[PDB]
Amino acid sequence: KTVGTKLVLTPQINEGDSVLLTIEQEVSSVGKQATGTDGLGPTFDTRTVKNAV
Amino acid sequence: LAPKVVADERTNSVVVSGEPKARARIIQMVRQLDRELQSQGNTRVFYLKYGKA
C-alpha cells in the first residue's frame, strides 16, 4: 500500500478559466517504523479528502 | 435502351451510360451534387467545459 503524501488528481478545464478538480488525497503514516498495533497488520494515520471542486 | 446512372467510390467517379442529352444533363447533375460541406458538417465535436465527456 502506498502511504505518504499522495495527490491523485484528474483536472478538467472550463473553456475559459475555472478548473474542475477531481481530488483523492491524504497524508497517511504507519505511526512509528519501530512501533506495533493492538491489531495484527500495520495501521495508518491518514488525512484524506476525495471530492470534485 | 435509354440513359442510366452509376458511380465508383474508389475514385469517386460518376458513370453515365446513354445519350449525349444524358451527357449534357448528367454533367449538370455531377455539378449539382459535387458541392462540398460548408463549415458545419454531419458530425460536430462539443468541447464540454464543466461536464465530463
Distance CA B13, CA A22 (A): 52
B29: CB partners within 8 A, 6+ apart = B5, B14
Closest-CA residue in chain B for A10?
B52
Contacts of A53 in chain B (CB under 8 A): none
Exp. method: cryo-EM
B3: CB partners within 8 A, 6+ apart = B16, B17, B18, B19, B21, B22, B26
Q: Is B47 helix (H, G, I), strand (E, B) or coil?
A: coil
Whether residues A16 and B52 touch (CB distance < 8 A) is answered with: no
Distance CA B26, CA A23 (A): 63
DSSP letters, A1-53, are ---SEEEEEEEEE-SSSPEEEEEEEEE-B-S-TT---SSSS---B--EEEEE-
Whether residues A20 and B50 touch (CB distance < 8 A) is answered with: yes
HSE toward the beta carbon, residue B52, CA cutoff 13 A: 8
The three cell numbers of residue A15 are 473553456
Distance CA B17, CA B23 (A): 9
HSE toward the beta carbon, residue B1, CA cutoff 13 A: 0
Distance CA A43, CA A31 (A): 7
Q: How far is the alpha carbon of A39 from chain B, nearest alpha carbon, in Å?
A: 42
